[PDB]
Design a protein around this nucleic acid. Sequence first.
DNA 1: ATGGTGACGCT
DNA 2: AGCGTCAA
Length: 430
Amino acid sequence: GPHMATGQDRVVALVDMDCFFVQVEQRQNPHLRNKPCAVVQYKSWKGGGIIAVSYEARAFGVTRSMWADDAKKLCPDLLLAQVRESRGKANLTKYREASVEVMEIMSRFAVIERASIDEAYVDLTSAVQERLQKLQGQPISADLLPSTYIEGLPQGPTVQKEGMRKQGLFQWLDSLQIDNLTSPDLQLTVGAVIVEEMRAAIERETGFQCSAGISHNKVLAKLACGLNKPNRQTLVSHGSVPQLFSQMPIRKIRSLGGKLGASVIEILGIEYMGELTQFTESQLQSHFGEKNGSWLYAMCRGIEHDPVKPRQLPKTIGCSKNFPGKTALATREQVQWWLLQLAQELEERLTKDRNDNDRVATQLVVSIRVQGDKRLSSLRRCCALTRYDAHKMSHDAFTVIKNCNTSGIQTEWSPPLTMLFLCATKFSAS
DNA sequence: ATGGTGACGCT
DNA sequence: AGCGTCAA
Ligand SMILES: Nc1ccn([C@H]2C[C@H](O)[C@@H](COP(=O)(O)NP(=O)(O)OP(=O)(O)O)O2)c(=O)n1
Ligand SMILES: [Mg+2]
Ligand SMILES: [Mg+2]
């Protein structure tokens, strides 16, 4: 009772940009706005591979990983924007720079964790405490939460979406205890007010819309965010968790979408997150390990302790290219040419990074895949990154991989290479 | 023949 | 360290 923690100590939000690469291209090209459209890379193989899709295009069934030629069969009027190609390869710079725009705005409100190119977590616990002071006990108006859903509401004793949103928000606000500065539900609510402000700032200053989740931890904030995407935010309270989790497939929880989550389902014979409550912590540790078992025991009760890490910048800068089918690299001059291409992009990004962010990478990671290997990497080795010089980095990369060429004739390369990867790591202040 | 990314865990 | 899992 009085000693059981309820994981209600923090306010955490997750901001996730809507159809991000599409919005970047739509800002640039007004002709793409409010249209079914998608972002594609490499036009020559079936119109290119789709990597992002507008909501209008999703209505037709267009999805990521579709070939654009195939997407056109579902959506004949689909518009496309192509990823930039430089030095023979797709180049994601425009989207990385657009991501910096958003992350810098979010950082004004709170210290962020850059989770991905278009997602960031924020811990709003401190900001909420401050705002609750300025809020000298006055009630929170529904007008301060114009795009907020309260998960699980309305409930109890209208057929249009916004109507329902407002009914749920009204039930929530009506039941709030605003005189108690330590009430978790009140803290979440103030967190949601701040996130409305944050999301308004992002849209005003960039043009980009996003969704957000507000809850007490990262897993619930992330789950919350997707519940009413796009262009809306969702508050998941501690009290909403039993119902929410009672029909929530285990794979929907972040980190459980792969083999571990499948093993949870198979070994325990359950389907939904809520069903995990019926196992003891030791039982879960016995099946899934000490760390995973404790994490699951707490998570299925809505409790998670993973902190929002103060990290706004990527920890690595990588350059990757696949060489599928017949395009696999079968000559030494090919391997050398493409290592240089990659190294040149890497050098460009590294020099900009060093100027912007006052740090230098000290390790170069070189990874390849040989044709016929079942593994995604046939070799992943490091060497020193002592100079931001493309010819040196490509020469060094060649040196660390040269002995995978089993061709007696070293002019040839066998087996052919189907992937090259260069990555700069282990940053030090500069 | 999705590809181009990127963080973190294990031994 | 090198490799694996999980994720945008
Ligand atoms: N497998 C993936 C997943 C995402 N991405 C890129 C394109 C996406 O616009 C961007 C963000 O990923 P995302 O959040 O999973 N999806 P996106 O923002 O497009 O749509 P939403 O469902 O978030 O509205 O990363 C990618 O290139 N390959
Ligand atoms: Mg997104
Ligand atoms: Mg995302």
